[PDB]
Design a protein around this ligand. Structure first.
Ligand SMILES: O=P(O)(O)O[C@@H]1[C@@H](O)[C@H](O)[C@H](O)[C@H](O)[C@H]1OP(=O)(O)O
Lengths: 6, 166
């Protein structure tokens, strides 16, 4: 995983 | 205001399940293992340790703090804590696609999405996510953090702390 957007 | 006293009792091994760190000539809680003597007294990540067994932590290195916890005297470890001095709370509201509008990597906020609730509430980057609606997220996987957010309702209250604490 790299970047999680929420 | 956020000052409290705690008494820690050492484990069967002789440990307390705590890691301390030196920041700005102060000592701060860096890690609290669950079901440990430190978790039992409500020690949280980012809490400042003012004194240990009648000695001020002021200007102690991480090395000295670590050594002091080992060379202690069993069932009696005394501490004065200042509750998370760098802690901040930010309330956000989900949009129609269920977003608060921020991006994070390893619990650390990296970007704020344009025209989101996080943008509106001035959420800052280079800040670690500590809690979502009072639930601790420190050291969970980013997916576990994401799944918790997705289930936190529309009103999302996050507790953050600048990256230099972690
Ligand atoms: O566990 P840490 O060290 O935080 O590394 C990441 C973690 O930050 C988080 O993104 C997890 O979802 C991921 O699985 C894990 O490994 P990955 O990013 O290599 O998948």
């Amino acid at each position: 995983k790299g970047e999680t957007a929420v | 205001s956020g000052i409290r006293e705690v008494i820690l009792c050492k484990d069967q091994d002789g440990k307390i399940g705590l890691r301390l760190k030196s920041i700005d000539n102060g000592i701060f809680v860096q890690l609290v293992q669950a079901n440990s003597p430190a978790s039992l007294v409500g020690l949280r990540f980012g809490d400042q340790v003012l004194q240990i067994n009648g000695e001020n932590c002021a200007g102690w290195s991480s090395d000295k703090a670590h050594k002091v916890l080992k060379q202690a005297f069993g069932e009696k470890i005394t501490m004065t804590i200042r509750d998370r001095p760098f802690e901040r709370t930010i309330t956000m509201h989900k949009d129609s696609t269920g977003h608060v509008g921020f991006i994070f990597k390893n619990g650390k906020i990296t970007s704020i999405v344009k025209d989101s609730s996080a943008a509106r509430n001035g959420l800052l980057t280079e800040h670690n996510i500590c809690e979502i609606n009072g639930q601790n997220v420190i050291g969970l996987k980013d997916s576990q953090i994401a799944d918790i957010l997705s289930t936190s309702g529309t009103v999302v209250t996050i507790t953050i702390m600048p990256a230099f604490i972690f």
